[PDB]
């Protein structure tokens, strides 16, 4: 039950049974229970460097202050090789009631100049929840905004004290196109930003990039052209949205965007990159954007 | 003769050097030639440890001239370090700072040879409080590196080492002591 179940999960995932998933359109998520409006709004329009974090062994959301002290005494120790660390549970960034509660790790420098504000969450991640034992608080996602030097040091502290490991989450152009399609499929209003897809042609001498930055309403009326089954988005529908982009770019510029790869998909819901510096979370659909991000971090974990 | 020669030296220790009829050195030089063959038995090393440094003649050259080659033949025993813990007593006599440096250098170098390192480990704070000395620090740090155990990592010692690091400069000896205390109960963190 406790380990062989993960074995079967890995076996099934590697077996590669048909996985065009009829994922539901991201639903307008009313801010559940106690989500701190100031804290949650602080996490929205901030660029998170995506990481896939293995379950924290012997972790507890009761011993926050002593972990904060141990990590603060280690951060300033790496400067020896002015800084405050405040572990902060978020109380509402979870998909199911059984998910581990999301907690923050903020490097606060006199005033509240939050230098790093790292963030661990497990939302709709009940595929790794039912595979870890009770001692592991599985938080597949890790969201660090501060400098990579502080991230790659708090990651080492977490590895040392919880046996949890940080593989840098990289959203491939497949998942990038997927999340591009569902985030224009939302029922949002007052589109914050233009729906931009940053492509990158695979030239060996040069490094040309393309920004297919649709008007967010024009990318919605274009999605409704390729949207036939309601509620769920199909891989056929996602590929048809991407192919409508391809055949409307090649119609003008005569270069095949399908021969390129997505590197970033800016959307009024959430911007998303490939190299890891992915999650800008403009709109408060984030319980679904982070659901996709955790279910993608689970994939890298398992 | 080695025992008898050092009792003869002790006879020189009960009287002034001027009032003595024979040289204080020449007998100790014969002892040094003996050390070139055989340095000091456990009782002999104990005795030459305990008396030649407290208050008596023990000239800072003559005491060091022995302490260079005063090392044990078999090993060092508990009674060796006992009465010389009254040499680290550091007072009117004090076994002055050059011979003190040589003493802690000997304590580091012959630390591989103690019958019971646990007894000296229970003498941890006596050497730890001698670490405040600048001249003794580079060698007392090594001695404590070889002397350390978990029972000797009380938080007041951790904060004393941090106070020493703040007051003094960044030193490899203090860095080694701090990394070791971090290897034990982590009241401090340093890499």
Swiss-Prot record, chain A:
GO cellular component, one term: nucleus
Entry keyword Disulfide bond: no
GO biological process: chromosome segregation
Positions of modified residues (Phosphothreonine): 19
Location, primary (coarse class): nucleus
List of residues that carry Phosphoserine: 15, 29
InterPro entries, alphabetized: CENP-L
Keyword tags: Centromere, Chromosome, Nucleus, Phosphoprotein
Annotated localization: Nucleus; Chromosome, Centromere
Domain of life: Eukaryota
Subunit comment: Component of the CENPA-CAD complex, composed of CENPI, CENPK, CENPL, CENPO, CENPP, CENPQ, CENPR and CENPS. The CENPA-CAD complex interacts with the CENPA-NAC complex, at least composed of CENPA, CENPC, CENPH, CENPM, CENPN, CENPT and CENPU.
Family: Belongs to the CENP-L/IML3 family.
Protein task: Component of the CENPA-CAD (nucleosome distal) complex, a complex recruited to centromeres which is involved in assembly of kinetochore proteins, mitotic progression and chromosome segregation. May be involved in incorporation of newly synthesized CENPA into centromeres via its interaction with the CENPA-NAC complex.
The protein's name: Centromere protein L
Swiss-Prot record, chain B:
Biological processes, Gene Ontology terms: CENP-A containing chromatin assembly; chromosome segregation; mitotic sister chromatid segregation; sex differentiation
Induction: By follicle-stimulating hormone (FSH).
GO-annotated cellular components: cytosol; inner kinetochore; kinetochore; nuclear body; nucleoplasm; nucleus
Key words of the record: Centromere, Chromosome, Nucleus, Ubl conjugation
Post-translational modifications: Sumoylated. Sumoylated form can be polyubiquitinated by RNF4, leading to its degradation. Desumoylation by SENP6 prevents its degradation.
Coiled-coil ranges (or none): none
Domain of life according to the entry: Eukaryota
Localisation per UniProt entry: Nucleus; Chromosome, Centromere
Location (main, coarse): nucleus
Ligase keyword on record: no
Protein's job: Component of the CENPA-CAD (nucleosome distal) complex, a complex recruited to centromeres which is involved in assembly of kinetochore proteins, mitotic progression and chromosome segregation. May be involved in incorporation of newly synthesized CENPA into centromeres via its interaction with the CENPA-NAC complex. Required for the localization of CENPF, MAD1L1 and MAD2 (MAD2L1 or MAD2L2) to kinetochores. Involved in the response of gonadal tissues to follicle-stimulating hormone.
Subunit structure: Component of the CENPA-CAD complex, composed of CENPI, CENPK, CENPL, CENPO, CENPP, CENPQ, CENPR and CENPS. The CENPA-CAD complex interacts with the CENPA-NAC complex, at least composed of CENPA, CENPC, CENPH, CENPM, CENPN, CENPT and CENPU. Interacts with SENP6.
Family according to the record: Belongs to the CENP-I/CTF3 family.
Protein name: Centromere protein I
Record organism: Homo sapiens
């Amino acid at each position: 039950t406790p380990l062989q179940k993960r074995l079967e999960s890995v076996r099934k995932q590697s077996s590669f049974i048909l996985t065009p998933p009829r994922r539901k359109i991201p639903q307008c998520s009313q801010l559940q229970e106690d989500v701190d409006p100031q804290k949650v709004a602080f996490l929205l329009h901030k660029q998170w460097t995506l990481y896939s974090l293995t379950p924290l062994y012997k972790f507890s959301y009761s011993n926050l202050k002593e972990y904060s002290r141990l990590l603060n005494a280690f951060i300033v120790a790496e400067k020896q090789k002015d800084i405050k660390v405040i572990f902060s549970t978020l109380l509402g960034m979870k998909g199911t009631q059984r998910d581990p509660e999301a907690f923050l790790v903020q490097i606060v420098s006199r005033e509240g100049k939050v230098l790093w504000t790292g963030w661990f969450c497990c939302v709709f991640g009940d595929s790794l929840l039912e595979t870890v034992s009770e001692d592991f608080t599985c938080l597949p996602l890790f969201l660090a905004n501060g400098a990579e030097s502080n991230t790659a040091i708090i990651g080492t502290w977490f590895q040392k004290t919880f046996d949890c490991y940080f593989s840098p989450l990289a959203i491939n152009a497949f998942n990038l196109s997927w999340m591009a399609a569902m985030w224009t499929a939302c029922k949002m209003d007052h589109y914050v930003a233009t729906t931009e897809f940053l492509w990158s042609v695979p030239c060996s001498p040069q490094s040309l990039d393309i920004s297919f930055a649709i008007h967010p309403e024009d990318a919605k009326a274009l999605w409704d052209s390729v949207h036939k089954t309601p509620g769920e988005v199909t891989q056929e529908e996602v590929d048809l949205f991407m192919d409508c982009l391809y055949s409307h770019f090649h119609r003008h510029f005569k270069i095949h965007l399908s021969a390129t790869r997505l590197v970033r998909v800016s959307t009024s819901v959430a911007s998303a990159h490939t190299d890891g510096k992915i999650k800008i979370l403009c709109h408060k659909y984030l319980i679904g954007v982070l659901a996709y991000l955790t279910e993608l971090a689970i994939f890298q974990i398992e | 003769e080695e025992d008898a020669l050092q009792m003869a030296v002790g006879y020189f220790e009960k009287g002034p050097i001027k009032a003595s009829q024979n040289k204080d050195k020449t007998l100790e030089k014969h002892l040094k030639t003996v050390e070139n063959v055989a340095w000091k038995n456990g009782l002999a090393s104990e005795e030459i440890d305990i008396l030649l440094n407290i208050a008596l003649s023990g000239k800072f050259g003559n005491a060091v001239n022995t302490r260079i080659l005063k090392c044990m033949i078999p090993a060092t025993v508990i009674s060796e370090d006992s009465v010389v813990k009254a040499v680290s007593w550091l007072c009117v006599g004090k076994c002055s700072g050059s011979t003190k440096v040589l003493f802690y250098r000997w304590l580091v170098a012959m630390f591989d040879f103690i019958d019971r390192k646990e007894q000296i480990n229970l003498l941890y704070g006596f050497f730890f409080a001698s670490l405040q000395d600048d001249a003794l620090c580079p060698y007392v740090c090594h001695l404590l590196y070889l002397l350390t155990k978990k029972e000797n990592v009380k938080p007041f010692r951790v904060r004393k080492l941090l106070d020493l690091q703040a007051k003094m400069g960044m030193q490899p000896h203090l860095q080694a002591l701090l990394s070791l205390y971090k290897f034990f109960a982590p009241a401090l963190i340093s890499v």
